[PDB]
Amino acid sequence: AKTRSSRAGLQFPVGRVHRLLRKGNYAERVGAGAPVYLAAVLEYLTAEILELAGNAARDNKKTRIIPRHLQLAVRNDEELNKLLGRVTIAQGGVLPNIQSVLLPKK
Amino acid sequence: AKTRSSRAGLQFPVGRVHRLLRKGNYAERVGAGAPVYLAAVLEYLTAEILELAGNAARDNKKTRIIPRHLQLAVRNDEELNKLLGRVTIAQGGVLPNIQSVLLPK
Amino acid sequence: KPHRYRPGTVALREIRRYQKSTELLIRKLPFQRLVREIAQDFKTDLRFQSSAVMALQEASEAYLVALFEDTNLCAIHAKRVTIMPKDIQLARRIRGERA
Amino acid sequence: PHRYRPGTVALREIRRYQKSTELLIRKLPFQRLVREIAQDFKTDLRFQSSAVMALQEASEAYLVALFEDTNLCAIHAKRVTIMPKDIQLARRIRGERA
Amino acid sequence: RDNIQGITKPAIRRLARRGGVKRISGLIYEETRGVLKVFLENVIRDAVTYTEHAKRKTVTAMDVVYALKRQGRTLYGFGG
Amino acid sequence: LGKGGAKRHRKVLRDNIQGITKPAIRRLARRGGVKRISGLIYEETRGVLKVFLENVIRDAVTYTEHAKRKTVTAMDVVYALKRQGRTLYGFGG
Amino acid sequence: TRKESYAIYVYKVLKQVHPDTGISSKAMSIMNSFVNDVFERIAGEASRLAHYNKRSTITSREIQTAVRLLLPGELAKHAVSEGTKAVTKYTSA
Amino acid sequence: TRKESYAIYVYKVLKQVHPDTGISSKAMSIMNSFVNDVFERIAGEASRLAHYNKRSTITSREIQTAVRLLLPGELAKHAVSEGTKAVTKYTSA
DNA sequence: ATCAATATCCACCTGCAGATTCTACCAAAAGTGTATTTGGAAACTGCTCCATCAAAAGGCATGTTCAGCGGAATTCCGCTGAACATGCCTTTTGATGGAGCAGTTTCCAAATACACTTTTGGTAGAATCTGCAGGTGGATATTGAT
């Protein structure tokens, strides 16, 4: 007896991802590798956000990641910001940004 | 022998709509009422746009509806316009419209 | 001789200030009434989960803040720094919310 | 000789092209552009002719609608002449560039 | 007061501030209340339809979250 | 015959964006209700259009490759457009 | 090899509303897209509606909420009546 | 009362990246949102890929094309690698 | 450009709300065996797309002339920001009934699953049909010119 997640070398739920697929009405049948592949990709994307979110946590002298750190991580990254282009991260604020023309004479 | 659309007093094909719901994996099962209802909605909206389009055709003194009539129909009706706000009708053109500031004295 | 900060200086201060934080900006209760009121026009005798009303506030403020960013670019485009009703209108027009 | 004043033929053209549905870009040139771009993603590819047509219908409706927005932008700045900063602003708010 | 009026110039100005706005025309305030109203009427109309369909009497965060998704305004961190 | 070569060559495609001409760009603007056009608008439209086509074509070809086909079909384009939120009626989709 | 479309139906409906009016193939193609598009939007909304409610069946009840979620007010009101009517009539068979 | 979530896994993964780092209640909720959203988009895109090709099965081939249509440039390439790795590994076991 | 008035930043301590870890249940995933089905391979086909070729005219490019647009600059009224004194009300606990959202068991109507009789929608098509595309021009405006 071995978790499909371990045979694939993943932390993510290969088995539940497989069940979420059957139940979601995406297709009649779901091939063997599909849940593995998808689990693998979901883990990858999570590791990416947490990594950037993490660094964002450090940079603010804190050790635990709050929503704001997720926001800074996503909106500062060209690619993630595009993937989450029409998604609102609750309690994330906005990136500091003042239109230079608004700055006082200098 | 009686088509399932005829007892629903509809022109759209209830059987067909019923199979498409199946073939599409929208749900494990499809109740008997669902395709009757959806086919009535499709028939309705198509009658609605054919009405508006036929009028646009008749205004251009044309007998057969072409794409520009469908476009005139949709864009002149708030609702259909919103229903199809992210849709492009091929060969439809745009509504004749010029911003006031660009006009002469 | 009192001390007066020049017009606009306190304004830029509030900007850096609020762009640093993530806390809501509409008083929670006043917001609760507006939401209850609106829902009422759709279905009477309605109850809302707490998070439900919270979700709406997060959504509402994210929406408005972003519209202000767009509204500001429209003002700047017209060579101004004051945002006006027409800037909001041009933004919503181009986004597809109007028509 | 005769000379219409600047803006007159322009307005005539607007009325002319808003009254029709003909594609406004030459076919062949458009087509080469499609195969060129497509060849850069995958080599040896043929196209159903309707495929090119669909791309041209989608491209022109997109550009025409983008010109409408751009136009509102120029008019917003009290101009009647559209400019790159007007196209740039329209795409920024549409969320294409930003 | 109409409740919408409960959305004060100071709150609005604050939102505008996070939006990077520096100056603000006096009419902006009303214009903003109308815009907000229209926004909430849209989401809530959809949220309620979900409640109503669920033969329920309470509007859950999930109804809101679904309405927002439905409106292309996907929200994270309240379920879903 | 199925020997040394690649089975004849069609001329190399280059600089085709320049085919979208100033006159064509003005015609589209006219339909968009534009009365006056700055000289710099032409190159800007070409670049915008190039980004537009790359995006759609990139998706279309992705469906094409997926079907293990060598011909980009109208359905491929139609799905590509739907995908980008630019649904097109009149080509099978 | 054989493909389908709502063409014959769209034609039946065209004659009821404009008996002396016809339709070009292009215009009919567009009409065929419209039906398929609306069909998908409605079925899709119904599908997720059912999922949210842990229902495994899509009933006319789900189609109805979908129609309400999807269509603009006045259109929703009429479509819902034509649909409630059709089903009711159907049942009396 | 039993209510599923990806929280534990998110947390395992977090540790693999930032061993000496934690995460607020809300932030973890957001992460769960994320995984569901992305799951849906990929599944759904995969779902229509299979339908466009008149295929009744969703294999990793579909998940792969889906990831390509959905993820921005570099994000897609990396995701695809990871995806392929695990399937390869999973078969070698 | 120096004070001088003020706001934002940053150091240290400490206790609790909120995060992390531990503690046994059990829904769900994994393991084995039988049954059902999908979709690549091989082999022949047939529509479709590619690439010419030839003729010719529609439309692109270029150069000239100048109308009028947009932006620089100066002016000046009044709208909005900063400041401040007054008090209304939103916010924080938090404790208390009960409308309601759910968890559990029962089970009829409603929805499969499958074999069969029967109709209808799609396709080819020769026939005929017939809406309307494409090309010319004076009557009716409306300038642009003088």
Added chain:
DNA sequence: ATCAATATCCACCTGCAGATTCTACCAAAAGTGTATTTGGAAACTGCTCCATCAAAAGGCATGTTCAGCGGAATTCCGCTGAACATGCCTTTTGATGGAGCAGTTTCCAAATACACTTTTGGTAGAATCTGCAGGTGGATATTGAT
């Protein structure tokens, strides 16, 4: 203001492809009629958590005051694009042939869908644990006037 140069719309008429009418083949579909499985409403009651009145209380909304400077109007003129005319390139059109590809048909097996019983990974509530919100205030820093 009078007069010539002109674009567009609507009528003129036959030229033919695109739409409509049978003629009929004819299967993939839909309808009909059993045997059969089951999703979900219905009655039922627990553990949520939603509405709410108490209500002290200071954080925050508000009304007024004073003038800073921003927006909007006006005046002006360089020079950029609009209009147009000339030359002629290349797109458009239409008929033609060749091949590579797509699509249909038959088949063998690898792969997936059950069906059922055995094994824990994941969840919830409780017990253990700690990161950072907060309070205080001189230090650092930026702003504004004489």
